[PDB]
Amino acid sequence: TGDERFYAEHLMPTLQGLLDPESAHRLAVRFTSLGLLPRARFQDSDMLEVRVLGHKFRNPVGIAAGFDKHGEAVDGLYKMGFGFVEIGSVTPKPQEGNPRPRVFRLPEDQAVINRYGFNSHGLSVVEHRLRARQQKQAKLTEDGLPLGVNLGKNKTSVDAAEDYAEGVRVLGPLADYLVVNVSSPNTAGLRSLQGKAELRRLLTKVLQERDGLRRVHRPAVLVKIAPDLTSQDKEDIASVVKELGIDGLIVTNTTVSRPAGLQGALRSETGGLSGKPLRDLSTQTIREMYALTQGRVPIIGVGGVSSGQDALEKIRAGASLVQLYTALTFWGPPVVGKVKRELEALLKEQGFGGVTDAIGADHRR
Numbered sequence: 364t365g366d367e368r369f370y371a372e373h374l375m376p377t378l379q380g381l382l383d384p385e386s387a388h389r390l391a392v393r394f395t396s397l398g399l400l401p402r403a404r405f406q407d408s409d410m411l412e413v414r415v416l417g418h419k420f421r422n423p424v425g426i427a428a429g430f431d432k433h434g435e436a437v438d439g440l441y442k443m444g445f446g447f448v449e450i451g452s453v454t455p456k457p458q459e460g461n462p463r464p465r466v467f468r469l470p471e472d473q474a475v476i477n478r479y480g481f482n483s484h485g486l487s488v489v490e491h492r493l494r495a496r497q498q499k500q501a502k503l504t505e506d507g508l509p510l511g512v513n514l515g516k517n518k519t520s521v522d523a524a525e526d527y528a529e530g531v532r533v534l535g536p537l538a539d540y541l542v543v544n545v546s547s548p549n550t551a552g553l554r555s556l557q558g559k560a561e562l563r564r565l566l567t568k569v570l571q572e573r574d575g576l577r578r579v580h581r582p583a584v585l586v587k588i589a590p591d592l593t594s595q596d597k598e599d600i601a602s603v604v605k606e607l608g609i610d611g612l613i614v615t616n617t618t619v620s621r622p623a624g625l626q627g628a629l630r631s632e633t634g635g636l637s638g639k640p641l642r643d644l645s646t647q648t649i650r651e652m653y654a655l656t657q658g659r660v661p662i663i664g665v666g667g668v669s670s671g672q673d674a675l676e677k678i679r680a681g682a683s684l685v686q687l688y689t690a691l692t693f694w695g696p697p698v699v700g701k702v703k704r705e706l707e708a709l710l711k712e713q714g715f716g717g718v719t720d721a722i723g724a725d726h727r728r
């Protein structure tokens with residue numbers, strides 16, 4: 364595609380050269396929300412369709428949380444070609460996040476480091492924004508374009524569980540699925556919620572609140588986890604997920620590790636690292652969680668996806684759906700159709716009838 368080359372070689376590096384990453388992101392969100400996007404030519408074939416989490420997904424490629432933190436660009440994101448959209452993380456009260464600068468590009472590594480710290484418009488603002496297009500979303504969902512809402516907690520909150528509970532109550536009725544984000548590396552103490560006792564307590568409350576919602580407004584509940592967990596952490600999470608009937612896992616958030624070989628000048632900035640250096644660490648975590656849950660717990664795979672091959676590797680490792688964010692920074696909007704086109708070609712080449720046949724295929728080898 365000509366657009367791919369142009370965006371990759373000319374548009375994005377020029378956007379990068381003119382703007383700091385946070386300003387560039389704000390502009391990208393603005394343009395997306397207005398539908399100012401290149402022609403997403405790609406037509407989703409039937410082999411890309413996936414049924415999971417109580418929904419049809421027209422294609423398995425979603426936008427990861429963090430790009431549209433406040434629910435401002437959902438429709439533009441479907442227009443960009445994503446098969447599902449996840450917004451957030453959203454915190455109960457509005458909060459500004461960390462002091463700037465708080466996001467950094469590592470172009471030599473095709474990576475990003477960020478320490479936003481849950482900048483959020485808060486539940487009330489996001490609730491009204493989603494309500495204003497609620498019925499349109501109901502039609503998109505029925506048409507195979509579901510919406511996820513990712514929940515965070517306020518910096519100063521005492522009771523983390525009540526923060527998530529409030530999120531379930533307020534945005535649960537507007538979501539096809541909710542994500543309990545306990546893996547941000549940029550909120551103090553948050554990742555300790557992944558520990559077995561804390562996680563069991565937290566998710567019991569979350570699921571209780573969720574089950575209290577009326578049937579048509581009752582979302583699936585997923586937990587998003589870190590790529591930096593011990594084997595013990597992962598066994599415990601799998602055990603709690605099965606004990607409580609958690610509907611799925613998002614694997615993974617950004618890494619606090621700094622893999623050997625990073626070249627970017629900004630590699631030693633504090634924050635979560637995303638993009639290419641995270642890719643295989645994420646894929647291996649998917650592989651492990653799929654095996655630990657016996658392939659019975661839907662996984663959304665995320666981390667360093669920028670091609671059909673990247674997507675297919677996560678799917679074969681056990682992901683039913685995948686997401687991307689960082690690749691947009693470097694490739695722009697044409698990366699979405701690129702991933703889908705390459706994925707379809709590889710599925711055919713490898714003998715799969717469709718995405719569904721490929722899920723977890725590595726484990727049946």
Ligand SMILES: Cc1cc2nc3c(=O)[nH]c(=O)nc-3n(C[C@H](O)[C@H](O)[C@H](O)COP(=O)(O)O)c2cc1C
Pocket residue numbers: 427428429430432451452466475477479481513544547587615616617637638639641665666667668686687688689690
């Ligand atoms: C700038 C930025 C902000 C992010 N914000 C969130 C967030 O608010 N909540 C969340 O669950 N993940 C957040 N993420 C993580 C992404 O959703 C994703 O898990 C991670 O970036 C790995 O995927 P990627 O390599 O395709 O970017 C953020 C990532 C980036 C780069």
Ligand SMILES: Cc1nc(C)c(C(=O)Nc2ccc3ccccc3c2)s1
Pocket residue numbers: 391392394395399400401691695696
């Ligand atoms: C016909 C057009 N007019 C404008 C202003 C376009 C544009 O730059 N769109 C972009 C560019 C980069 C992006 C990067 C991320 C997300 C959306 C994006 C949209 S395409």
Ligand SMILES: O=C(O)c1cc(=O)[nH]c(=O)[nH]1
Pocket residue numbers: 452477478479480481482544546547548549616617635636
């Ligand atoms: O807001 C953040 O800084 C943020 C949250 C999250 O879940 N992941 C991330 O990399 N950063």
